[PDB]
């Protein structure tokens, strides 16, 4: 259940598709929780490309259904991402996801 909320600007038409190399800004929440990862903090803004399971299932949905200069928030489910096992020391088991996404991409 990947749920899409936009903060509105950007293009509209610019779509990700395969093949391609994006560039996101993003930053992560915990669920009632505290920060746990931020590409703002490092500045090294992630470039990453899309099919290649690099990324979770649930950012990987989100990243397609977005355009260049959006801004989404993102809602990933527990059993796209982590939610048996859980990332050691850092994801707890049976966890949900927020991300602040922001698109600002190439290709």
Do not use: W
């Amino acid at each position: 259940g990947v749920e899409i909320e936009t903060i509105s600007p950007g293009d509209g038409r610019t779509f990700p598709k395969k093949g391609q190399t994006c560039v996101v800004h993003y930053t992560g929440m915990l669920q009632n929780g505290k920060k746990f990862d931020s590409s703002r903090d490092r500045n090294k803004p992630f470039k990453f490309r899309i099919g290649k399971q690099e990324v979770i299932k649930g950012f990987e949905e989100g990243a397609a259904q977005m355009s260049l200069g959006q801004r989404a928030k993102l809602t990933c489910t527990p059993d796209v991402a982590y939610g048996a096992t859980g990332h050691p020391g850092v994801i707890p088991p049976n966890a949900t996801l927020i991300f602040d996404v922001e698109l600002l991409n190439l290709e």
